[PDB]
Design a protein around this ligand. Sequence first.
Ligand code: NO2
Ligand code: NO2
Length: 251
Amino acid sequence: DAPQIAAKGYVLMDYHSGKVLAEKEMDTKLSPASLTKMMTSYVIGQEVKRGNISLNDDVVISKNAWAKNFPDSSKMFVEVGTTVKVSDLNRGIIIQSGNDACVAMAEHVAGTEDAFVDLMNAWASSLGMKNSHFTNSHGLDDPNLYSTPYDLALLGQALIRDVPEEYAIYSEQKFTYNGITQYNRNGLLWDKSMNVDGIKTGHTSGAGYNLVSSATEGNMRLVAVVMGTDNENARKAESKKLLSYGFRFFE
Ligand SMILES: O=N[O-]
Ligand SMILES: O=N[O-]
């Protein structure tokens, strides 16, 4: 008896087999918003593993990455004409959810945001995200930027599976850049009763708060996606319920 989850859509997936244990509106399209950053970090993770970029490179911060372009949204607080290290931009993306850092990495990886988006969709396709399409590296709204809870689950799973060095970064609780400290918004990282080590948080303006989470217990690993909860407390509680049910499902 799957429990009731106060969310517009969700999916709970066994990480090992990829089997869906429970779901609601699993394949219905939504605006993923800041969860789009998981795809950005996925592409960055592949580039780092293959050696096309190094964590020690100095990245140019262009006009397009200027903090000035992202008023009202989360930022790492990067400045034009300076350089920032790849590892630092990565954490800005993952921990701080900084849109500025997304654009800077996009450019460092593929020259322009558009080409970076080409790599994002080519990876989405090879991962089996058949109901997803990206238009930018950060998630700000666009009619053609969409995904689904199920696809987002595949993405979370792929992060843990294919880019572990990138995935480890999702359990870091905070990050400081330029004397500005920001916390990882995934509150489940602080829960002592559970071993939640990811993944990413976000908000979709007409729907609500979202969370893509993963946790382990014994030899089990689950990936859960909850979309459209009414507030940050519900985002945590409903994800925790979803996950506990999965741990109990295998019994
Ligand atoms: O802690 N998640 O809102
Ligand atoms: O079969 N152990 O998750």
